[PDB]
Design a protein around this ligand. Structure first.
Ligand SMILES: Nc1nc2c(ncn2[C@@H]2O[C@H](COP(=O)(O)OP(=O)(O)OP(=O)(O)O)[C@@H](O)[C@H]2O)c(=O)[nH]1
Ligand SMILES: *C[C@H]1C(=O)[C@]23[C@H](O)[C@H]1CC[C@H]2[C@@]12CO[C@]3(O)[C@@H](O)[C@@H]1C(C)(C)CC[C@@H]2O
Ligand SMILES: *C[C@H]1C(=O)[C@]23[C@H](O)[C@H]1CC[C@H]2[C@@]12CO[C@]3(O)[C@@H](O)[C@@H]1C(C)(C)CC[C@@H]2O
Ligand SMILES: *C[C@H]1C(=O)[C@]23[C@H](O)[C@H]1CC[C@H]2[C@@]12CO[C@]3(O)[C@@H](O)[C@@H]1C(C)(C)CC[C@@H]2O
Ligand SMILES: [Cl-]
Ligand SMILES: [Cl-]
Ligand SMILES: [Cl-]
Ligand SMILES: [Cl-]
Ligand SMILES: [Mg+2]
Lengths: 123, 995, 209
């Protein structure tokens, strides 16, 4: 699985979208458990998200300090941010992601954990 | 590209290039594969491509090229065969027959090219449909002759005959005219004597297993239609039930044949045929016991291991035993020499039932239901099966599913309920002993204890009250032991839920012992405080179900109790519901609503209702005073959430109380419609200020939730109201003022489809009492809603569906409202109905055709008056032709019966002379002409222009038959289906319409 | 690599393309664009017995876009027949799709799939669905929308094709993701894309997740 080297800081149920530019519309990329994983070797924290049942990776990227969480117009329980390099598909690619949670509480908690992970990744 | 050469028909076909393009498609990848696909499609779809088929079959080295060549022939044969000169037809027959014989003679080709030979055989059968037997009389005798010359040819002829039987008997109904179906059935029936002679010879004579398989494959098809005497007055049953069960390559197909043999129509008064039905079963079971596995074999382990075709064979055994025993087990129940054969067969099903396969288990469970129901009602039967029934109790109890899976659970409940009645003592021991196994820990598991709990719940109501009482006490006592045994809150929570589930399922026990019932409710309230969300929702769900079952016990004052317990619940409702989520609170209030509806004293119920709604009414009153103090104080999204939840609490209580809710609706009604207007203004203001995107924001969605829940509350009450005078005099006028103008004057994306839904319910229950009300509803929603849905079939799907629901109920209850329309608006009504016809949306299409039928019926009621005469002259032929368009365009097949029904009604009006005036304008046809004559001339012209490949004779015969059959739906539908077949081909026989 | 040809057949509208797209990309397409002839997509799953690859032949259900029709079934190693539980005509056409399929592929594993079980108003009830029993098809209630049982058809086919009934899907390995090293030249562009994404609403806002 390549997750044994890592400690689970935070785990939350979420749905992930990527913005398609050609058509101006959001497209689902996966639904399942979103995990914040701290590498015990490097102390670097990444987002790893796996789809329900298939267990395929829909999100795999470092929680970069530069990244900023921006609210969607149509959701108080979602965050939209730009990821420079995601390797879920295979080769590092730039995405405009949106991630939606079960409640405003979960989204607010995600925002605090994301910022905690960013401070760790600066060192 | 280079591959596009084959599309150029001005040049002779490069056969070697075709074979590359075909290989690039089947063996290739990426853009190359996709490009090859578009080229092969365009080649195939070329109307002259059939001319190349002879060329390709002779010279191509690629079997897939030859396959697609036969697809192109298949296309020509089914659609344009009769257009060919007779020389070409005999020519094509010869190189198809020649190619089949060629491939059979080459042992390498016959072994390795099965796809191509099967396709050739099917293509030959398509020619037989066209020519045989009128233009090919000696085909069957020729085919029988060719069989003796070669084993490969003999085998391949069994595939030809199999496909021929499939096309004529199994799949003819859809694809041929009734007349052509009958002709081919009769032709095969006359010559089957000779076909069976060959099939019996081959099977009896034997040798090549593949030949035997192909021969047995063909027999499976024959068994669908042939007379019983071919099975019963020959040696063939002995051969199927003995010889062909021993060899495994023929075992699968023989077992499928014997399954179909059990379904053959047979005289019930023949003692010999009965012995023969017993004998083939005895033979088959004997072969299984000695050649495959004994009765004691673990079929669960065998299936799970999944070696070779064990799975398909065990499936086919289950189908055979259940099919046979469901029809014939009565034969085995009288004669005590047959007792062992009956119980062995049932013991095979027991072992099959233990297999871990949901679909296989469902098949066996269907049989077990059939049996135990028979033992429940049939006299002197049950004592035979006591040992089978005891084993089945364990099977069902060990495979019990949760109640959420309704079809399987209800199937299992019903079998286990029957089994409990048949022996209450045995069921008790099995469940108690299984519980003991959980306590000892050998079988202890979360799934096992849960699955046992569902089983114990299922049988509630079957035992005597006194037996149930003791059994329930024992189960609860044992379950409480488990809690003491297992530490850790997770493990305790699993059994705690199970314990609550059981008490939920046994209401009669709760009714009997008030103290126990009271203790359980208080624990649920304690459980509602629990931090874990799972516990809270479990606790809430249990409370509603117990309440539904024992509602009467709450409302009355119990012995040694100060007051009715409902009174006690309402005192502490605030405290009890403090930790629950909104929708869990709504369930609680709904439950209290169920109890309050049992009190039939008007004074005591209205007081209990007032006490129940205390908290939301006080919360409502504060927000009513602060809201009208300044409408800016409604911008707070937290205030929007509390309002929604107050309305939703009112919906929840109204759902369970219906007519009894009216006093509470009275308390909030005028301020609630005021709130509807205030929320409406904010949404319109917000739209202008932020744009269309505004309707997607949490703020506006928040406001729209308030509007929808208000409409839902009003819709819920009026759907269940007793006092309809109070609905009209009090509720309707304020509602229509509040919702209709707001709906009309909002932009499309701000219009709530729930308005249309609410209006439908109003017109349903009080439409006849508010003729002016229905007029007002049409004017407000009709023209502007039609404009939202009349540009495409996709946009505003909810509005689309609720629109035609509303037009349907108005047309049923208050048709007068359509007579009061301006002519231009009535024309839009007819346009709207025909617009519904063309939808693939099943909800819209069905309503569309129903409105049309109800409209024609409404016009007929009016009799000979100006509006009905004007209706028919303006709109009769629009309905006839628009109905014909959707009947014949192949894209609306799901609406076929209602189309037929409407078309039948319209034709009947003319032939019953219910239309008083000429439908034609003067100087279009001779002055004295009947509507009967003009209808057939109009329809002839219409169908001629729409289907120019049909002859005048085809169209004339069709209309002659169809018009005569206007009172006979089943035959009328037959004639329409005959027409749909003939429009797909050229040269349809006009005599087919005389069937 | 260990790869198998899977043909996907059934009436127009049943959800064949939606189902495959959901497996390929994770997206749920709400629009109905009828497939022309066939669409071939590689689909890989990770199992405890290594990776398995399906070449998914997603065929057109509509007669007019039928293309090569039974031409697509040649040398298929397994199949899925799709119908819509909200459309009775799509279940009535299952025997026709099956007939065409087995006339080309005599002995392959086939899943029968009832799609759109998420819709409350179900028109083809569980009781009526029995065609799979005599034809030895595996059956599953599925929903491409709710993802109910959506892994099941591929898991069962994987088990039959490899010939191992203990075969499981497993978590694919998750490599270390790389350092961002953001460049200011494209910073301006990414910002523009971000601005647009914020202003577009996320679909199905009333959904549970
Ligand atoms: N509610 C619901 N809608 C679904 C589901 N699966 C698909 N749909 C929708 O139904 C339609 C199905 O479209 P497709 O998947 O393209 O249909 P198809 O079966 O590939 O059609 P053809 O290519 O014409 O054979 C689309 O509008 C889908 O979004 C489902 O599980 N639930
Ligand atoms: C279907 C073929 C077959 O099995 C035959 C012939 O080839 C043909 C019909 C009759 C069968 C025979 C003659 O040769 C066969 O190959 C063989 O199966 C039969 C034998 C056993 C040789 C004799 C009886 C019958 O005439
Ligand atoms: C097994 C658990 C359980 O169900 C209990 C307790 O939560 C725990 C041990 C004892 C059970 C009770 C008390 O509360 C329970 O939830 C409830 O199921 C039992 C009742 C019926 C309320 C009374 C006896 C026992 O003390
Ligand atoms: C469909 C109509 C029709 O054509 C009928 C009747 O008017 C009605 C049902 C049965 C048809 C008749 C009786 O009168 C009809 O007008 C006439 O077309 C039919 C005749 C030819 C008289 C005899 C058969 C049938 O009873
Ligand atoms: Cl071939
Ligand atoms: Cl006979
Ligand atoms: Cl009661
Ligand atoms: Cl003619
Ligand atoms: Mg498609």
């Amino acid at each position: 699985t390549m997750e044994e080297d890592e400690e689970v800081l935070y785990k939350v149920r979420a749905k992930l979208f990527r913005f398609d530019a050609d058509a101006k519309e959001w497209k689902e990329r996966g639904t399942g458990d979103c995990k914040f994983l701290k590498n015990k070797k490097t102390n670097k924290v990444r987002i790893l998200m796996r789809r329900d049942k298939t267990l395929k990776i829909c999100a795999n990227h470092i929680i970069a300090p530069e990244y900023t969480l921006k609210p969607n117009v149509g959701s108080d329980r979602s965050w939209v941010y730009a990821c420079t390099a995601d390797i879920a598909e295979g080769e590092a690619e730039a995405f405009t992601f949106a991630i939606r949670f079960g409640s405003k509480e979960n989204a607010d908690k995600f925002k605090e954990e994301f910022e905690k992970a960013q401070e760790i990744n600066k060192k | 590209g280079s591959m596009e050469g084959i599309l150029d028909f001005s040049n002779d076909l490069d056969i070697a290039l075709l074979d590359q393009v075909v290989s690039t498609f089947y063996q290739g990848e990426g853009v190359q594969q996709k490009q090859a696909q578009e080229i092969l499609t365009k080649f195939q779809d070329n109307p002259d491509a059939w001319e190349k088929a002879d060329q390709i079959l002779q010279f191509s080295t690629n079997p897939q090229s030859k396959f697609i060549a036969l697809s192109i022939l298949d296309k020509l044969i089914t659609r344009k065969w009769k257009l060919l000169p007779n020389d070409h037809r005999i020519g094509i027959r010869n190189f198809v027959v020649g190619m089949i014989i060629s491939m059979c003679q080459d042992d390498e080709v016959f072994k390795t090219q099965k796809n191509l030979i099967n396709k050739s055989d099917l293509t030959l059968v398509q020619i037989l449909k066209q020519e045989w037997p009128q233009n090919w009389p000696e085909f069957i005798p020729e085919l029988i002759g060719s069989s003796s010359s070669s084993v490969n040819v003999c085998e391949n002829n069994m595939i030809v005959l199999k496909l021929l039987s499939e096309e004529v008997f199994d799949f003819s109904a859809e694809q041929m005219t009734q007349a052509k179906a009958l002709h081919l059935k009769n032709s095969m029936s006359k010559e089957f004597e000779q076909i069976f002679k060959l099939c019996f010879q081959v099977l009896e004579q034997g040798s090549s297993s593949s030949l035997i398989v192909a021969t047995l494959e063909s027999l499976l098809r024959y068994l669908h239609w042939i007379p019983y005497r071919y099975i019963y007055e020959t040696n063939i049953l002995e051969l199927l039930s003995t010889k062909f069960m021993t060899s495994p390559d023929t075992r699968a197909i023989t077992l499928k044949c014997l399954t179909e043999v059990s379904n053959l129509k047979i005289p019930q008064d023949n003692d010999l045929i009965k012995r023969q039905t017993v004998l083939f079963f005895q033979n088959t079971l004997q072969q299984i016991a000695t050649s495959v596995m004994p009765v004691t074999a673990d079929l669960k382990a065998t299936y799970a291991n999944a070696n070779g075709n064990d799975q398909s064979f065990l499936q086919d055994l289950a189908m055979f035993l259940t099919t046979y025993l469901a029809r014939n087990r009565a034969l085995l129940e009288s004669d005590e020499s047959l007792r062992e054969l009956l119980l062995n067969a049932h013991q095979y099903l027991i072992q099959l039932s233990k297999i871990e396969e949901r679909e296989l288990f469902k098949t066996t469970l269907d049989y077990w239901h059939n049996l135990v129901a028979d033992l429940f009602y049939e006299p002197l039967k049950k004592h035979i099966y006591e040992e089978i029934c005891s084993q089945l109790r364990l099977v069902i109890i060990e495979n019990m599913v949760r109640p959420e899976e309704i079809q399987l659970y209800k199937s299992e409940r019903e079998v286990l309920v029957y089994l409990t009645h048949l022996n209450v003592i045995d069921t008790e021991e099995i469940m108690i002993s299984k519980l003991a196994r959980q306590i000892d820990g050998s079988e202890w598991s979360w799934h096992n204890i849960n699955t046992l709990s569902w089983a114990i719940g299922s049988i509630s109501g079957t035992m005597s009250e006194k037996t149930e009482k003791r059994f329930v006490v024992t189960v609860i006592k044992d379950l409480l032991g488990l809690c003491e045994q297992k530490r850790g809150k997770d493990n305790k929570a699993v059994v705690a839920r199970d314990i609550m589930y059981v008490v939920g399922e046994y209401p009669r026990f709760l009714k009997a012992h008030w103290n126990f019932l009271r203790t359980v409710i208080l624990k649920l309230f304690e459980f509602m405080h629990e931090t874990h969300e799972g516990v809270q929702d479990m606790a809430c769900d249990t409370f509603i179900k117990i309440v539904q079952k024992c509602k009467y016990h709450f409302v009355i004052q119990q012995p040694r109790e100060s007051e009715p317990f409902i009174q006690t619940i309402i005192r502490d409702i605030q405290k009890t519901t403090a930790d629950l989520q909104p929708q869990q609170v709504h369930t609680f209030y709904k439950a209290c609503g169920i109890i309050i509806s049992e009190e039939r004293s008007v004074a005591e119920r209205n007081r209990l209702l007032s006490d129940l709604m205390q908290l939301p009414n006080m919360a409502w009153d504060t927000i009513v005073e602060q809201s009208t103090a300044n409408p800016t104080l409604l911008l707070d999204s937290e205030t929007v959430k509390i309002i929604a939840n107050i309305i939703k609490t009112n919906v929840a209580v109204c759902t369970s109380m219906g007519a009894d809710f009216y006093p509470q609706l009275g308390h909030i009604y005028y301020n609630m419609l005021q709130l509807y207007r205030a929320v409406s203004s904010m949404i319109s203001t917000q739209v202008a200020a932020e744009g269309l995107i505004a309707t997607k924001t949490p703020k506006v969605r928040g406001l729209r939730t308030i509007k929808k829940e208000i409409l839902k509350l009003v819709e819920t009450y009026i759907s269940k109201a007793r006092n309809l005078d109070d609905v009209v005099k009090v509720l309707v006028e304020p509602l229509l003022n509040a919702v209709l103008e707001d709906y009309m004057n909002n932009v499309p994306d701000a219009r709530d489809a729930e308005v249309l839904n609410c209006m439908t319910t109003v017109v349903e229950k009080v439409g006849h009492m508010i003729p002016q009300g229905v007029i007002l509803i049409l004017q407000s929603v009709f023209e502007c809603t039609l404009d939202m849905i009349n540009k495409d079939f996709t946009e505003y799907p909810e509005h689309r569906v609720e629109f035609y629901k509303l037009l349907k109920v108005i047309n049923e209850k208050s048709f007068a409202a359509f007579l009061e329309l301006p002519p231009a608006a009535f024309k839009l009504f007819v346009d709207a109905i025909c617009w519904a016809f063309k939808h693939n949306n099943r909800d819209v299409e069905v309503n569309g055709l129903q409105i049309a039928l109800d409209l024609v019926k409404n016009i007929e009621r009016m009799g000979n008056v100006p509006f009905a005469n004007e209706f028919h002259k303006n709109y009769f032929f629009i309905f006839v032709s628009e109905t014909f368009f959707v009947l014949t365009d192949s894209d609306h097949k799901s609406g076929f019966s209602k189309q037929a029904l409407l078309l039948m009604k319209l034709i009947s009006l003319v032939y019953d002379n219910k239309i008083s005036v000429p439908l034609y304008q003067e100087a279009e046809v001779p002055q004295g002409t009947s509507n009967q004559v003009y209808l057939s001339q109009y329809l002839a012209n219409m169908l001629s222009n729409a289907f120019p490949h049909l002859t005048s004779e085809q169209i004339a015969s069709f209309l002659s038959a169809l018009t005569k059959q206007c009172k006979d739906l089943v035959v009328f539908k037959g004639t329409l289906r005959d027409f749909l077949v003939q429009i797909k081909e050229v040269g349809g026989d006009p005599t087919d319409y005389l069937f | 690599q260990v790869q198998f040809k899977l043909v996907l057949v059934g009436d127009g509208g049943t959800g064949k393309t939606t189902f495959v797209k959901r497996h390929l990309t994770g997206e749920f397409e709400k629009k109905y664009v009828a497939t022309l002839g066939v669409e071939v997509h590689p689909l890989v799953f990770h199992t405890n017995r290594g990776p398995i690859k399906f070449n998914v032949w997603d065929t057109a259900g509509l007669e007019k876009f039928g293309g090569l029709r039974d031409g697509y079934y040649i040398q298929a190693q397994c199949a899925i027949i799709m119908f819509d539980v909200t459309s009775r005509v799509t279940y009535k056409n299952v025997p026709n799709w099956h007939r065409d399929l087995v006339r080309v592929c005599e002995n392959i594993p086939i899943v029968l799939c009832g799609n759109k079980v998420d819709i409350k108003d179900r028109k083809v009830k569980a009781k009526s669905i029995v065609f799979h029993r005599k034809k030895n098809l595996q059956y599953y209630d599925i929903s491409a929308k709710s993802n109910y049982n959506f892994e099941k058809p591929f898991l069962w086919l994987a088990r039959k094709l490899i010939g191992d009934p203990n075969l499981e899907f497993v978590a694919m390995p998750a490599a270390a993701p790389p350092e961002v090293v953001m460049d200011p030249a494209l910073a301006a562009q990414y910002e523009h894309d971000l601005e647009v994404a914020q202003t577009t609403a996320l679909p199905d806002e009333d959904d549970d997740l």
